[PDB]
Paper text:
Although these steroid/sterol reductases share very little sequence similarity, they all use NADPH as the cofactor to reduce specific carbon-carbon double bonds in their steroid substrates. To our knowledge, the reported structure of human SRD5α2 with the dualsteric ligand NADP-DHF represents the first structure of eukaryotic membrane-embedded steroid reductase.
Human SRD5α2 was expressed in insect Sf9 cells and purified in the presence of finasteride and crystallized in lipidic mesophase with a space group of P622. Unlike the bacterial sterol reductase MaSR121, the structure of SRD5α2 contains 7 TMs (TM1-7) connected by 6 loops (L1-6). The structure of SRD5α2 revealed a large cavity inside the 7-TM domain at the cytosolic side formed by all 7 TMs and L1, L3 and L5. The cavity is completely occluded from the cytosol with only one opening on the side of 7-TM domain between TM1 and TM4. Strikingly, after ligand fitting, the distance between the nicotinamide C-4 atom of NADPH and the C-2 atom of finasteride is shorter than 2Å, suggesting the formation of a covalent bond. The same study indicated that SRD5α2 could catalyze the hydride transfer from NADPH to finasteride, leading to the formation of a covalent bond between the nicotinamide C-4 atom of NADPH and the C-2 atom of finasteride17, highly consistent with our structural observation. It is likely that SRD5α2 took endogenous NADPH during recombinant protein expression to catalyze the reaction with finasteride supplemented in protein buffers to generate the NADP-DHF intermediate, which was stable enough to be captured in our SRD5α2 crystals.
Numbering used by the authors: 5 to 38, 44 to 254
Amino acid sequence: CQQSPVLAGSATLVALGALALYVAKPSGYGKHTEATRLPARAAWFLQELPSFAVPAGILARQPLSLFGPPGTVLLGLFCVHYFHRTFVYSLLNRGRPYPAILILRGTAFCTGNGVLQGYYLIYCAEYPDGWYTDIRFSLGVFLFILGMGINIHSDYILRQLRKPGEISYRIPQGGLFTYVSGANFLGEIIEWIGYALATWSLPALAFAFFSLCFLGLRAFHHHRFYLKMFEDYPKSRKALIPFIF
Ligand SMILES: CCCCCCCC/C=C\CCCCCCCC(=O)OC[C@H](O)CO
């Protein structure tokens, strides 16, 4: 198990997070983005696919027994998330046309990240014997399914705000959106923090930190957008963290 490529992957993954904050301006593929584009369903399909296929391939070489290592089962949860993100979320996506340029970078991210998380958990990660009863797992797994529930529940609420083909932004109403503008982001952030907690691993903590930086900035700009574009937007709402930010 080479420890040098691992520390480097977590470094870039963190440096990326820092870089996204330095630019301050959003990644520009949704709201603040206004023949160089392609359908968003195909875009997010291609972008997020590596973060599924690579861990799926890594898993496919391991024995089939749930009565086995914790690092494998956790990698399965990573695979379960990006299965939804690719084949369910992305293929049902109702977003505007996506910039072709960003796909290769988005794909590059999900490739390296998929390699990092998958390689570490199998070849590097080492867990004690009573991990499934440990508070880090029992809470970490809890936070994971909690955040995923929130992330998917909110992405669906957002999806039902449009008919396919529509170019429009309506005020997101419904569960947990009543408190924060970026409810789906809140969920995903909760999801990876718990994931880092359940794996107790450096590269997972890094990806969680990136997601916090990226989606946390994305949430803020979304919050800005609503306050800028809707005179009757609920002013009790916050950007990301309820009653705080
Ligand atoms: C020996 C342990 C010393 C450090 C104790 C820290 C306790 C957790 C405190 C804050 C993190 C909470 C939010 C993030 C969830 C935890 C994931 C994590 O940090 O795991 C990395 C692990 O420590 C790599 O050895």
